[PDB]
RNA sequence: UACGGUGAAGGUAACCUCUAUUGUGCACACAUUGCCCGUCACCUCCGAUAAUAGUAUUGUACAGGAAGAACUAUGGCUACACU
């Protein structure tokens, strides 16, 4: 009700995380069987999108305020 | 052609015939010169058969054996729900 809006960021923190290393692992394993089939013409459509799902970039356990300084750099 | 004068010889075993009578046989009636035979001869026509040139299909010896793949997997990835 009102927890599934504390639960959506906490569940899609796990979720956002949980996509992260399962597309990488099989972003990985797509790479070992890129050359044995041909794989990398496939593969690139996971190489891209399987990232650049909903935010590719992860929101940073520091917040990311050394980067705002290195973008708020004179 | 016709009419008389004299005027004899001579006769029965299929002994052929020309039949009949017949009642035993034909595939003959153009009624035995028939019906109709075959080796072959020139040719024509479907066979039957076959060394083989082989192509069409399947069993089996193994290599295979693609796409698939009974089985085997916990390398995973995730929520259900409960912490």
Redesign the pocket.
Known sequence: HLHELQDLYR?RQ??M???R???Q??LE?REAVAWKTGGRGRAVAAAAKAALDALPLPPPEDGGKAELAAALAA
């Open positions: 569940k796990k979720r995380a949980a996509l290393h399962g597309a692992v099989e394993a």
